[PDB]
């Protein structure tokens, strides 16, 4: 509940928006080799 008095801006303090990041990519994707298996104990 606090008011503010804002003076006209000056060129002394200049800020800029960020450029879009390089968005992450999905992993390589596991290379799965199908096969038939017999497990021995």
């Amino acid at each position: 509940a606090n008011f503010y008095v804002c003076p006209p801006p000056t060129g002394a303090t200049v800020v800029q928006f960020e450029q879009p990041r390089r968005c992450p990519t999905r992993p390589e994707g596991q290379n799965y080799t199908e096969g038939i298996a017999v497990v021995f104990k």
């Binding site: 509940a1 606090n2 008011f3 503010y4 008095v5 804002c6 003076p7 006209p8 801006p9 000056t10 060129g11 002394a12 303090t13 200049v14 800020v15 800029q16 928006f17 960020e18 879009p20 990041r21 968005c23 992450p24 990519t25 999905r26 992993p27 596991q30 080799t33 199908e34 096969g35 038939i36 104990k41």
Partner: protein
């Protein structure tokens, strides 16, 4: 292996549960990593598109955009393709008096669109005239003037609530 047309004695552990847990963890991990990753990817692309909205919103009302985009209540100014910013001075609510009438006694037919106020920076400072702004900001120049119209009913934010005016009067 398959493709679609497109001298020692080995000791075996008595519990497969390590392997099964491995399978469970791998399946849950793969699923959560995949979906979360997609979330993260969609999140990044979301902000990448959101910047397009932000580039025009900063033109619409630079003060509000800068306030958040920076993290402190600041006033911004469009100086071409960038915004010049300056920090605003906080003021307590009790140091603001709202003038009741927004009609201009010196110019018939022209009257203030936004409430006029008297404010003091300090409790003992001189009384300074101005007009209220949007989202509790103070404007020094009372140049927000419009032709007076019939059926004038307005709300304006003030402190922690709102102040209601009728017919260019409090």
């Amino acid at each position: 292996p398959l493709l679609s047309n497109t001298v020692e004695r080995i000791k075996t552990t008595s519990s497969i549960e390590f392997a099964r847990l491995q399978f469970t963890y791998n399946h849950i991990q793969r699923h959560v990593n995949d979906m979360l990753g997609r979330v993260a990817i969609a999140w990044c692309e979301l902000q990448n598109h959101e910047l397009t909205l932000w580039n025009e919103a900063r033109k619409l009302n630079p003060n509000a955009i800068a306030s958040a985009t920076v993290g402190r209540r600041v006033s911004a100014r469009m100086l071409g393709d960038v915004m010049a910013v300056s920090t605003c001075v906080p003021v307590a609510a009790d140091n603001v008096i709202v003038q009741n009438s927004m009609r201009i006694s010196s110019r018939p037919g022209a009257c203030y669109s936004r409430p006029l106020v008297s404010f003091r920076y300090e409790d003992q400072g001189p009384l300074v005239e101005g007009q209220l702004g949007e989202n509790n900001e103070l404007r020094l120049t009372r140049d927000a003037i419009e032709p007076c119209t019939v059926g004038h009913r307005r709300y304006f934010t003030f402190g922690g609530g709102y102040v209601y005016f009728e017919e260019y009067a409090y």
